[PDB]
Amino acid sequence: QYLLPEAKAQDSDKICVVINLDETLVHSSFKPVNNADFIIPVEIDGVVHQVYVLKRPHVDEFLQRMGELFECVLFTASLAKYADPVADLLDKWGAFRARLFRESCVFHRGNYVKDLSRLGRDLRRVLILDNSPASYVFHPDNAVPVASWFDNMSDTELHDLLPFFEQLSRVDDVYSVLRQ
């Protein structure tokens, strides 16, 4: 059994992109944040705590365009009790065709690894967007690096990455660009 079902007919010819959440699209902490974008109550050991969520700049332009260009998949090492509410609020266009959480990761030498071989997709047509190069140790030639984001509101990386994803969305084999 693979992590993903068969791609829907409107996704089948597109490239798959697995997209990280924390420090890629949003940043959260339990330390109170003024003027947060979302606050999500998250139960931990039977006590609800408020998780304060900041949206990385340009993330709506990014998700909205990505969902057109790709079969986008949320793939995070966090628990669904936190990720699903965040994703529900972020994904205003249905970009994420599937959601994969910590239980879908592989623990490898102290690190949760997104083993792309388990998605059920030709790896010539799979990309991973993740701020943590450890997340894609088994598939470095599938990766589009992105710097970890916390609160810098001057950041523009999601904006700056789009014309490159525009190119990638049209190739037959991502390795022809990323070299493998």
Binding site: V51, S78, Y82
Partner: peptide, 7 residues
């Protein structure tokens, strides 16, 4: 610690 490298 929301998405942690390690538990």
């Amino acid at each position: 610690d929301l998405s942690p490298p390690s538990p």
